[PDB]
Design a binder for this molecule. Structure first.
Ligand SMILES: N[C@@H](C(=O)O)[C@H](O)[C@@]1(C(=O)O)CC[C@H](C[C@H](NC(=O)c2cc(Cl)c(O)c(Cl)c2)C(=O)O)N1
Ligand SMILES: N[C@@H](C(=O)O)[C@H](O)[C@@]1(C(=O)O)CC[C@H](C[C@H](NC(=O)c2cc(Cl)c(O)c(Cl)c2)C(=O)O)N1
Ligand SMILES: [Zn+2]
Ligand SMILES: [Zn+2]
Ligand SMILES: [Zn+2]
Lengths: 258, 258
């Protein structure tokens, strides 16, 4: 009865410990979600195996095939018991899997190279010298596509039409584009990742502005799972013990480089 | 099949409309939670009657008698079908009722009279000229009592034995105390209330510093309620439509007096 935990290699949530690539078991991994998994398992009393999601995806339903990929798919199709990862709680997902209460809050935020004269989304939408974009298939893009806020609608119209593309294939590519673009590119991404990258060498990026929206990460289990209730109370307990904030501080700031 | 909704009279969540003392029905009430109930009801397809919690309490279990008071009491003792109110999601409550995903995020924050030279909790912790405190019974006090964080334990050491007492019996008392103390008292309270009060005449208080913790308000239903699932999905849907942010803006800022 070892619980299969699906997760995704994403710093600082889940990372290969230095020189552990040829070792085995859960002990290979470190990070915020590894710490959280250990605490969840301790409090619900189960043994578990951390497994990295095969396709490296979080979880979206293919428009055409209607098949769920990523961690959500591993839960929906019965290949994992629990997903402990920075998995956003969303309507479409909650329709097919169960989420705990959020263990971390976040929102959409702007990443700039230090010195870029931009302080807000409004600032970006007013000008054209600084290009801006987001992940090509992501939550951020969808936020802008659906938004009725004038400023965000203005940004969406600029982004959808800009040429060559302002969208990027991965977060790493978004960050590289900010870093290499001499202040002429800003990247819109989850605040949690923005604040992480701000603490990494070469310390040349900054988070600016308030968050544009408000969402949370949750631990996910298959519908009807007998683990769901326990995991949920465990998340609330860990929050009340200050453990979630302690873990955030540890992996973002105590281990920070700036 | 009219759903009985319990709530509590707390601005700007639920308020008596001006001069409506002698009027009847749902129409007497206005506010953020009144607007939210109307959305939840519409999206889940039910008719409802708003009632104000009998005993004016949120929901605590009497340590001795183990009886639940307030809105939690009304769900668990069968007097109301759903609570839509600024009810914090906590471990002890989630053991006896179900919570929706949070519709609003919040945390402990600092309220000062404008002009007071304090910018953060750490600032407060390093001095004694400005007294500071919290509701004498409630989440905030317990947060500080429990906290292993240096600055917070230091503040708890101070408040525990402060004289005259730094604690206040109600929230209006805490606010009044800030307002009347000529800059010599700071009040620790929910960030949502802090930012509401900041927009209310006489516009003489200020919210300072980041939040000291993170919590959420959720809609509460009894275990096994036939409403739980739909309400949870409605809350996610409203957040994604941008409606929860639109509501917060409406009741805090659009109707603000400052
Ligand atoms: N925490 C992640 C997530 O839970 O998917 C992020 O939201 C992330 C992103 O920023 O978009 C990280 C990469 C990943 C990409 C991709 N996700 C999406 O396509 C997506 C995600 C959400 Cl939450 C959504 O509402 C919509 Cl309309 C689409 C993934 O499946 O690998 N999703
Ligand atoms: N939104 C309210 C809540 O849901 O009870 C507040 O948290 C509030 C407070 O700030 O304490 C407002 C009045 C009310 C008082 C009282 N509740 C408590 O005493 C309490 C509440 C929480 Cl969330 C908690 O973690 C602990 Cl350890 C104790 C009551 O329920 O009327 N609780
Ligand atoms: Zn090792
Ligand atoms: Zn523990
Ligand atoms: Zn609606």
């Amino acid at each position: 009865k070892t619980v299969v935990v699906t997760t995704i290699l994403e710093s600082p949530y889940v990372m290969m410990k230095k020189n552990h690539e040829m070792l085995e078991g859960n002990e290979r991994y470190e990070g915020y979600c590894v710490d959280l998994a250990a605490e969840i398992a301790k409090h619900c009393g189960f043994k578990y195996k951390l497994t990295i999601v095969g396709d490296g995806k979080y979880g979206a339903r293919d428009a055409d095939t209607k098949i769920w990929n990523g961690m959500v798919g591993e839960l929906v199709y019965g290949k994992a018991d629990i997903a402990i990862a920075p998995l956003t709680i969303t309507l479409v997902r909650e329709e097919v899997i169960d989420f705990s209460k959020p263990f971390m809050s976040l929102g959409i935020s702007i990443m700039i190279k230090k010195g870029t004269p931009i302080e807000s989304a409004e600032d970006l939408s007013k000008q054209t010298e600084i290009a801006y974009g987001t992940l090509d298939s992501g939550s951020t893009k969808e936020f802008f596509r659906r938004s009725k806020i004038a400023v965000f609608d203005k940004m969406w119209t600029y982004m959808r039409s800009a040429e060559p593309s302002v969208f990027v294939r991965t977060t790493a590519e978004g960050v590289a584009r900010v870093r290499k673009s001499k202040g002429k590119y800003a990247y819109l991404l989850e605040s949690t990742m923005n604040e992480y990258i701000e603490q990494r060498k070469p310390c040349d990026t900054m988070k600016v502005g308030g968050n544009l929206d408000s969402k949370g990460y949750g631990i996910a289990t298959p519908k009807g799972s007998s683990l769901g209730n326990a995991v949920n109370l465990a998340v609330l307990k860990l929050n009340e013990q200050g453990l979630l904030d302690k873990l955030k501080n540890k992996w973002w700031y105590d281990k920070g480089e700036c």
